[PDB]
Design a protein around this nucleic acid. Structure first.
Lengths: 107, 107
DNA sequence: CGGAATGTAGGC
DNA sequence: GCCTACATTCCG
């Protein structure tokens, strides 16, 4: 439909949801995946899982239009898998780091 | 072998971990449980899972004494299970509601 | 205790 | 439908 705005994507975060973007190297390139945690703690990685979640709980403030799985949407916490001699290692990115990482997964 | 400070239990939150306290109606009474998320997104509910995770991952600033499974330690995000005629909703507590939930599960 | 066996859920 | 990855159970 219409692309969701930062503000709409921040809405479920005021009603007990968490949003994360997680970046790592695959086949050719670096890619991002978006995770959501529902207020009960359930991890969801696919849009239709959120649709199934929303229809199983009471329809209030939070609707499908507030959800984006786009790793380019700078809302929530960002993390990246860095390969090192000590092993694969996840680090949370600073606000200042996020823009370079979104540029690197656009396309 | 000695009590961990709030400052120390907040430290892994500055290194890509998350702590949550979740308060549900149990068998008899209201009880809380503590979850940690490792920087990789792994959910851990028991202290021996954390020690096992620390032993198989790069040993940076975060060490075993920075961790508490106490639902009466006000560090991280708090959620409670609120049952109504509309159904079981989980809701995130404000900073202002937290001290009264902790009192209610002290005891 | 640290790993293997088995169960489960969601991904493809 | 099976497969992969995670959660839980089981073992000496």
């Amino acid at each position: 439909r219409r692309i969701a705005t930062p503000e709409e994507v921040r809405l479920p975060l005021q009603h007990g949801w968490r949003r994360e973007v997680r970046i790592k190297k695959g086949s050719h390139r670096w890619q991002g995946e978006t995770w959501y945690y529902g207020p009960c703690g359930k991890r969801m990685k696919q849009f239709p899982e959120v649709i199934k979640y929303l229809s199983r709980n009471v329809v209030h403030s939070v609707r499908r239009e507030h959800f984006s799985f786009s790793p380019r949407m700078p809302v929530g916490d960002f993390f990246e898998e860095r390969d090192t001699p000590e092993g694969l290692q996840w680090v949370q990115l600073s606000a200042e780091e996020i823009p370079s990482r979104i540029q690197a997964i656009t396309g």
